[PDB]
Design a protein around this ligand. Sequence first.
Ligand SMILES: [Mg+2]
Ligand SMILES: [Mg+2]
Ligand code: NA
Ligand code: NA
Lengths: 257, 250
Amino acid sequence: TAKSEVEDSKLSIISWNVDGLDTLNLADRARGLCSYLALYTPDVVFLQELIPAYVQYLKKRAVSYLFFEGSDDGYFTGIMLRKSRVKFLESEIICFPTTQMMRNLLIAQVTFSGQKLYLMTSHLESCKNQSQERTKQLRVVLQKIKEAPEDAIVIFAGDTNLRDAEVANVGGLPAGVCDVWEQLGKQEHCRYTWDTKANSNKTVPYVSRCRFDRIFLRSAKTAPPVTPDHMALIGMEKLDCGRYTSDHWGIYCTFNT
Amino acid sequence: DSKLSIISWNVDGLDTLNLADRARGLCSYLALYTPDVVFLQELIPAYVQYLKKRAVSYLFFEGSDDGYFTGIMLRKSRVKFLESEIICFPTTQMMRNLLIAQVTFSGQKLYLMTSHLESCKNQSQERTKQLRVVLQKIKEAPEDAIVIFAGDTNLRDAEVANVGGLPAGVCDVWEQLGKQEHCRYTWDTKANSNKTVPYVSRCRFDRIFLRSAKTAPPVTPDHMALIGMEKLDCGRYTSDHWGIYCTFNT
DNA sequence: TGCAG
Ligand SMILES: [Mg+2]
Ligand SMILES: [Mg+2]
Ligand code: NA
Ligand code: NA
């Protein structure tokens, strides 16, 4: 098939923890997010730390998307699906029994470019000290990826809060599942998604750089595998209010679907 | 000595075993450290009756008149009192509140605050609401005041993060001083045997938040230590919490 | 008034 039919069949996603818990300039920052969505027109958006006012705003502005949320109050995750590109089939939420932070796993099954996709997001248990709970949640996520319908491509994207050796400590990713940043070459340029030296939204006594935001991919077991195409960190511009959209950078990523 | 000093301590007044001896222990610490300000939580009337009898160098403010409550003690020779107030927590189920005393310390205004935020792991909702109030008050305190909040926050991992973090200009003293491991945990069931429990739990419930005045150069914490981790004659610790001693460069 | 690594 020709170049343009191929470029049109490519899936695009954005994953972003929007820091809805930071009340400062929140309306301006939601406007910022919307400007990025208009720029990148992603097929799927995976969001974390939404709060009701924020998602209400998005639903009023981003009317070309269908919305699903991980909760109706507090703070929660969301999946947005571009209606002209992605056909919604069904959704569900899987609970994390031992979370103290209302965390869970939000799943949407869809059709895209003639293929079934299983789209997942979570905001895994926060803070270094919560390595144990986070790890448990990671296991659930990975199990759900392994077990997804054999004919589906699985894409999890979210704020994993994972740090050094936590994945290695569960034996690494299972066969058939890759971390997209790893698969694209472990590039330093687009590695850290939370960087308190570079991002001035929070004042912090000690700076750190972490790769909290991650994308895991599993191809269909019954079809040829798909590769990621390209990834970039986004949101590294300040808004008119003099702050960034979030204390995280977003990930923009395409796949050769 | 130009350095301001404070002690903050949840005295566990709800534990009545050896309470008199334990209040004596606390008084021994006050006599040694002679802090300018003492922030206390979980006082009960008997306990405070004792302290007021003994610590005559201090002016007392109490957060309630019965049940259990907080207190602020001011060293009369070092601190001049201006005014006090209590901010209520409308949805507390445990009579928690925010006790505030405004004072001057060699001419510099201090806005002193204490609270015992809603207790128990599962009360994170109410606790976080209360934390919001506290932080907002710290934010709104008079520009010419140094603000010191010290108290039993009952705070967990991410509860501060899940509120948006501390506001600009406001620091956690333990963090500011380098997250030193030896003055980290203030409630430690392994190291403290006052509570009979089977499990090990180690938490940083007791915290100090600091904001400078704009009318003066930034205040930095200088030295912090945990106190009370030695048994009294009665064979028990002063409290199930360790106390915090802290000095400031003003 | 149930950790952290
Ligand atoms: Mg956050
Ligand atoms: Mg207690
Ligand atoms: Na490609
Ligand atoms: Na000192």
